[PDB]
Design an enzyme around this catalytic site. Structure first.
Site, PDB file in Angstrom:
ATOM      1  N   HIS A   1      58.463  95.114  33.433  1.00  0.00           N
ATOM      2  CA  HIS A   1      59.218  93.903  33.754  1.00  0.00           C
ATOM      3  C   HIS A   1      58.771  92.785  32.870  1.00  0.00           C
ATOM      4  CE1 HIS A   1      60.677  95.558  37.535  1.00  0.00           C
ATOM      5  NE2 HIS A   1      59.421  95.771  37.941  1.00  0.00           N
TER       6      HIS A   1
ATOM      7  N   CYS B   1      64.105  88.677  35.000  1.00  0.00           N
ATOM      8  CA  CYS B   1      63.501  89.757  34.251  1.00  0.00           C
ATOM      9  C   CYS B   1      64.523  90.225  33.227  1.00  0.00           C
ATOM     10  CB  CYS B   1      63.102  90.901  35.175  1.00  0.00           C
ATOM     11  SG  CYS B   1      62.630  92.357  34.268  1.00  0.00           S
TER      12      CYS B   1
ATOM     13  N   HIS C   1      66.137  93.797  33.533  1.00  0.00           N
ATOM     14  CA  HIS C   1      66.733  94.057  34.801  1.00  0.00           C
ATOM     15  C   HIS C   1      67.595  92.929  35.316  1.00  0.00           C
ATOM     16  CE1 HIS C   1      63.084  96.736  35.251  1.00  0.00           C
ATOM     17  NE2 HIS C   1      64.076  97.499  34.823  1.00  0.00           N
TER      18      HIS C   1
ATOM     19  N   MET D   1      67.645  91.254  39.105  1.00  0.00           N
ATOM     20  CA  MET D   1      66.244  90.830  39.147  1.00  0.00           C
ATOM     21  C   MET D   1      66.156  89.451  38.533  1.00  0.00           C
ATOM     22  SD  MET D   1      62.844  92.923  38.275  1.00  0.00           S
ATOM     23  CE  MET D   1      61.304  92.088  38.605  1.00  0.00           C
TER      24      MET D   1
HETATM   25 CU   LIG Z   1      62.282  93.870  35.794  1.00  0.00          CU
END
Ligand SMILES: [Cu+]
Length: 99
Positions: free
Chosen positions: A37, A84, A87, A92
């Site tokens: 991440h 992130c 993501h 996210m």
């Molecule tokens: Cu992530």
């Protein structure tokens, strides 16, 4: 304030994702599940005059391993949206309010 990167059930989420703090209080983003991440502040969705690079990972940077952290403290009052990068479309994302 600790923020998990990935929930304990594997969901691609910051936990918590929406929160408030105070000027100078640590945010420790901690790799938890579903890593790698990162944490990137949206340069168009943070307070006036703030340098996103002082508070963000670049999009190319990653926290690779479980338990790795990225720490940041925010100074200037207002809303800061972050995500992130790999993501973001999975949802996210988050928003911290410095107040
Ligand atoms: Cu992530």
């Amino acid at each position: 304030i600790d923020v998990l990167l990935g929930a304990d059930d594997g969901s691609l989420a910051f936990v918590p994702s929406e929160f408030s703090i105070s000027p100078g209080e640590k945010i420790v983003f901690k790799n938890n599940a579903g890593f790698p991440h990162n944490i990137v502040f949206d340069e168009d969705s943070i307070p006036s005059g703030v340098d996103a690079s002082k508070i963000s990972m670049s999009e190319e940077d990653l926290l690779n391993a479980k338990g790795e952290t990225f720490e940041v403290a925010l100074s200037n009052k207002g809303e800061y949206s972050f995500y992130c990068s790999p993501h973001q479309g999975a949802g996210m994302v988050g928003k911290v309010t410095v107040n």
